[PDB]
Ligand binder design. Structure first.
Ligand code: HEM
Ligand code: HEM
Ligand SMILES: *[C@@H]1O[C@H](CO)[C@@H](O)[C@H](O[C@H]2O[C@H](CO)[C@@H](O[C@@H]3O[C@H](CO)[C@@H](O)[C@H](O)[C@@H]3O)[C@H](O)[C@H]2NC(C)=O)[C@H]1NC(C)=O
Ligand SMILES: *[C@@H]1O[C@H](CO)[C@@H](O[C@@H]2O[C@H](CO)[C@@H](O)[C@H](O)[C@H]2NC(C)=O)[C@H](O[C@@H]2O[C@@H](C)[C@@H](O)[C@@H](O)[C@@H]2O)[C@H]1NC(C)=O
Ligand SMILES: *[C@@H]1O[C@H](CO)[C@@H](O[C@@H]2O[C@H](CO)[C@@H](O)[C@H](O)[C@H]2NC(C)=O)[C@H](O[C@@H]2O[C@@H](C)[C@@H](O)[C@@H](O)[C@@H]2O)[C@H]1NC(C)=O
Ligand SMILES: CC(=O)N[C@@H]1[C@@H](O)[C@H](O)[C@@H](CO)O[C@H]1O
Ligand SMILES: *[C@@H]1O[C@H](CO)[C@@H](O)[C@H](O)[C@H]1NC(C)=O
Ligand SMILES: *[C@@H]1O[C@H](CO)[C@@H](O)[C@H](O)[C@H]1NC(C)=O
Ligand SMILES: *[C@@H]1O[C@H](CO)[C@@H](O)[C@H](O)[C@H]1NC(C)=O
Ligand SMILES: *[C@@H]1O[C@H](CO)[C@@H](O)[C@H](O)[C@H]1NC(C)=O
Ligand SMILES: OC[C@H]1O[C@H](O)[C@@H](O)[C@@H](O)[C@@H]1O
Ligand SMILES: [Ca+2]
Ligand SMILES: [Ca+2]
Ligand SMILES: [Ca+2]
Ligand SMILES: [Ca+2]
Lengths: 303, 303
């Protein structure tokens, strides 16, 4: 029971106002687009798309955003706040943080790849955000193909949709830490992952030191082919040994996944059409509707 | 007047002995294969395939190999000397340095790409080697499409063959200097060549400092996709903005050349078959035969 244009009557201007927020942000720093698409994904995989990822930590507990996979990597919170400030001045206590985040990811898909779709709305905001659930529910870049498939099945998403959605890594960046397993001490037999181009590896070793931590502020684009265009080049790059994350390279290590990649790589419009579906589908995981939850007036804190 | 099996009678073991020389060196350092293929190329473009590139400078004159595009980049000379020592112990004053280098490049194509072809022989060695002619006759990596086409025309090679032969950059390395134009001070409008991947550029900037010179001993593989396999991946990488040299990227800036790339990239046997013909053809530019020139007993020096 989520609908496109939930706010038709209650807040007609909302989708526009969010898109302006995002568009302003994007022109300053185009990295907010990939940032916000990841945020939406990280929302949806813990307690559903309920805005829980946006809550700050307190003295009471460490929230999701301060878990290892989220801090310091997640980015886009200013944008969300600014969209949310706009919307609250226009339709107070009406539009949820959950919908704003779903909307913003959609606006980022448009800005980064000209990918245009519509967003069912009527989500409500949760009151719970636990780092411990973030750790549990967010897949790691060290996952093999089977493990990726099982996260996503865990969220009622097909393998094929897992592959489709991985194409988000067609834009945005990675901290050194996230792929360090592949370029230092990979095995007893070699220092570097054989499934990663030895030239690329050499370059990544020179950019990213062995003592790198998750706070080391050194990043590298996930898609070496078209770093800022949300397109199907990710899938080409994965087939060419140019996949950056272990979880990226995982997609050609299993037959049905490997074929989905070939098709995504072979066909842009086809992947685009698929991506818009998967992400609309992702945006509907264990959502709160009706009277459930609240309309959080400040995204960073429970009312 | 060149024939396959020139030495059938005079030195039947020669082709084998050279292949052994090369094979031994290759197993110690696989970089000698690309090294030798470039050497053959650099021989053939100045005064013909006459062994001229192998001559040392004297107190009299600076030779080809001490010109900027050859020094310090050219490598493979010890290998050639070792094959030459072998062959002279076996068939004194019989096998030319020109043929040994043609042979060696062929042995390197086999080792690096399983590319097997036969080499017509009967070349003789020249007695002249000028740095000034090296500078004149060797194309620079800053060449646009037109300029590349005109070098090769100048040596009676078709544009299509130029494209085929560029495929040699599917293995081997480049010193930073050779592509430094692209990652520092490219224009007034931008620091980096926009036809080169922005992520790649950032990584090359990090490996290769701006103060770099042609003596700076820092190299980067020409083919980021399969750095040590002599295959058609060069051509893919060129189309994906991953072409390393300006002269590499040049090949998709002109419709005719750009279609030759698509073909090479789309079809491997096709490319392989063509490369073997082009290179045999390259090895017959302004060769000396019969009694012309000499059979140089020591490759580094005139008799
Ligand atoms: C399939 C399992 C996934 C894993 C294991 C994973 C993991 C990661 C990691 C480690 C990064 C880099 C973080 C860093 O070190 O800085 C990243 C980036 C990203 N991921 Fe994923 N990811 C996955 C799937 C997805 C999905 C489904 C989406 C969206 C639908 C997505 C969107 C993004 C985006 C947009 C970025 C770039 C972040 C930025 O540039 O700010 N990812 N991912
Ligand atoms: C088309 C015009 C060409 C230009 C401008 C050019 C230029 C270059 C440059 C600058 C390098 C790197 C040198 C350095 O800085 O270290 C290089 C490497 C190489 N080139 Fe070319 N090249 C061309 C054509 C060819 C042809 C026709 C062949 C073979 C038939 C060839 C084979 C090679 C090989 C094998 C290497 C690797 C060298 C090594 O690893 O030791 N190139 N080329
Ligand atoms: C031919 O004439 C050249 C100039 O007049 C002269 O430089 C040549 O030197 C060559 O001879 C030396 C030994 O005299 C060889 O040294 C060898 O080096 C390798 C490793 O680098 C060893 O495997 C080997 O055991 C030996 O010590 C050179 O390789 C060689 N150099 C070149 C470029 O040919 C002279 N040639 C001869 C055979 O006398
Ligand atoms: C909010 O207003 C929209 C029009 O301004 C509605 O969308 C339109 O719905 C028509 C039939 O419902 C359809 O023919 C139009 O093509 C569509 N327009 C667009 C731009 O999508 C919208 O209705 C919702 O969306 C459609 C796709 C269906 O799912 C409807 O059942 C939904 O109600 C209006 N939303 C609401 C909640 O009233
Ligand atoms: C890969 O390149 C080959 C060139 O070496 C193509 O084969 C050649 O195709 C010619 C038609 O243009 C034909 O006259 C030649 O006989 C043939 N040569 C050889 C050695 O096969 C090959 O083309 C495909 O295979 C041939 C036999 C025909 O069936 C074509 O219609 C095919 O396209 C190229 N392969 C592909 C998939 O393009
Ligand atoms: C004319 C110009 O912009 N020159 C630049 C210099 O400003 C810059 O600091 C350097 C980068 O390391 O490369 C060159
Ligand atoms: C790509 O697949 C789509 C499926 O939507 C199809 O309609 C389109 O014609 C395809 N294009 C090519 C060139 O295969
Ligand atoms: C919104 O919430 C956070 C508490 O996490 C607070 O620091 C921030 O300043 C608040 N903004 C406003 C305008 O109240
Ligand atoms: C050498 O022998 C081969 C095969 O036995 C032959 O085909 C080739 O043409 C011969 N070359 C010469 C110069 O006789
Ligand atoms: C080669 O040069 C020598 C002197 O170095 C000269 O006497 C001879 O005529 C030249 N021969 C050829 C074929 O160039
Ligand atoms: O092994 C090093 C060796 O290299 C070349 O072969 C020559 O310049 C020799 O004089 C030198 O001794
Ligand atoms: Ca959530
Ligand atoms: Ca991309
Ligand atoms: Ca020559
Ligand atoms: Ca290659």
């Amino acid at each position: 029971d989520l609908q496109i244009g939930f706010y038709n009557q209650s807040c007609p201007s909302a989708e526009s106002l969010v898109q302006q927020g995002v568009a302003a942000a994007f022109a300053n720093n185009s990295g907010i687009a990939p940032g916000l698409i990841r945020m939406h994904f990280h929302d949806c995989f813990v307690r559903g798309c309920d805005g829980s990822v946006l809550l700050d930590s307190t003295d009471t507990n460490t929230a999701e955003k301060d878990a290892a996979p989220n801090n310091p990597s997640l980015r886009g919170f200013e944008v969300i706040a600014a969209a949310k400030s706009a919307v609250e001045a226009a339709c107070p206590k009406t539009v949820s943080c959950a919908d704003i985040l779903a909307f913003a990811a959609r606006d980022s898909a448009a800005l980064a790849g000209n990918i245009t779709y519509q967003v069912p709305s009527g989500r409500r905001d949760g009151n719970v955000s636990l780092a411990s659930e973030a750790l549990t529910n967010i897949p790691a870049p060290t996952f093999n193909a089977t493990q990726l498939i099982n996260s996503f099945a865990g969220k009622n998403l097909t393998a094929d949709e897992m592959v489709t959605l991985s194409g988000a890594h067609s834009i945005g960046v990675s901290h050194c830490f996230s792929f360090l397993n592949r370029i230092y001490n990979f095995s007893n037999t070699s220092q570097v992952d054989p499934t990663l181009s030895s030239s690329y590896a050499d370059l990544l070793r020179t950019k990213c030191p062995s003592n790198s931590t998750r706070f080391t502020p050194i990043t590298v684009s996930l898609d070496i082919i078209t770093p800022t265009v949300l397109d199907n080049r990710y899938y080409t790059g994965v087939q060419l040994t140019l996949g950056l994350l272990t979880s990226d390279q995982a997609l050609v290590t299993e037959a049905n996944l490997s074929a989905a990649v070939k098709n995504n790589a072979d066909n842009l419009t086809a992947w685009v059409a698929e991506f818009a579906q998967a992400i609309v589908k992702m945006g509907q995981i264990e959502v709160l509707t009706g009277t459930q939850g609240e309309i959080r007036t400040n995204c960073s804190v429970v009312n």
